[PDB]
Structures are given as C-alpha cells and as structure tokens.
Amino acid sequence: SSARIAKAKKLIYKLEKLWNARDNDGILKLFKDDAVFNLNGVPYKGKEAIKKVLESAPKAKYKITKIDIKIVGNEIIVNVDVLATGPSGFTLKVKSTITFDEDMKITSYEVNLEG
Ligand SMILES: COc1ccc(-n2nc(C(N)=O)c3c2C(=O)N(c2ccc(N4CCCCC4=O)cc2)CC3)cc1
C-alpha cells in the first residue's frame, strides 16, 4: 500500500516523459483496457478510444509542478498540476487527476484545461 504511493509518484514522472516523447504505445500500457480518459469534460472509454486521443494530442511539452497523492478505498488518486507549453511558447496551467488501482494500472485519467 505504501509502495503503491511511491509507484504512483514514479509513474507520474514516467508519464511526463512519455507524454513529451509522444510514446502513445507506452502511455496506453499503463491504462486499463477499459479505462476512461476525461478530456475536458468529454470522456473517452476504451483503449482504442484513449489511443485515438493520444496521437491527436497537440504538439506540447509538459512539466510537472505539483503532485498530490490521495487514497480513497483501494484506489490511488493522484492530482497533478502540469504546465503545458505549445510550440509558440503559449503556456497553459492544466490539471490532471489520475486514478490507479491495485494493479498500478490507470482506471481514470482526467485532464482539466480550463484552469
Ligand atoms: C499549450 O496549451 C495546451 C492546451 C491544451 C493541450 N491539450 N490538448 C489536448 C487535446 N485536445 O487532446 C490534451 C492537452 C493536454 O494538456 N494533455 C496533457 C495534460 C497533462 C499531462 N500530464 C503531464 C505529465 C504527467 C501528468 C499529466 O497528466 C499530459 C498531457 C493531453 C490532452 C495542450 C497544450
């Protein structure tokens, strides 16, 4: 249970590298096959749907600035404050809520782009 908190912290920084590397194949492997990707209010359920959003994600570099890990039941809730940089230098304070289960696989992944 304590290792799960540490595993979650490492998987967040791993996700940051995969996102900036556009390793969409690797990103999916941490996802449960029936996970939900809530992209600013629009949920995308299923590996095939989460995928299509990954390769359609805009060209952007991400830097983690704050990580909060909460435990609710048997699920690891990770709230990540991210700064997303576009090629034009446009910077947006985005927020992500990632949920892990016992298998350390992502069950829910919500990206908030409003602020
Ligand atoms: C320049 O400003 C922007 C604005 C919007 C967008 N934008 N567009 C989409 C889309 N229309 O698909 C998505 C994003 C985004 O910001 N996404 C993301 C959010 C957060 C993370 N990170 C960082 C690593 C660890 C935690 C974590 O969750 C990784 C990717 C994916 C989706 C980009 C740039």
CATH number at residue 16: 3.10.450.50
- Which residues constitute the domain of residue 42? 2-112
Residues with Cβ < 8 Å from 21, sequence gap 6 or more?
none
- Whether 109 is in the pocket of ligand 1, judged by its Cβ within 6 Å, is no
Tell me the structure's resolution in angstroms, rounded to a single decimal: 2.2
Strand arrangement of the beta sheet that strand 106-112 belongs to: 42-45, 31-39, 106-112, 91-100, 75-85, 61-72
Query: Total structural domains in the chain?
Result: 1
The protein residue with its alpha carbon nearest to ligand 1, atom 9, reads 57
Atom of ligand 1 nearest to the CA of 109: 28
SS (H, E, C) the chain: CHHHHHHHHHHHHHHHHHHHHCCHHHHHHCEEEEEEEEECCEEEECHHHHHHHHHCCCCCEEEEEEEEEEEECCEEEEEEEEEEECCCCCEEEEEEEEEECCCCCEEEEEEECCC
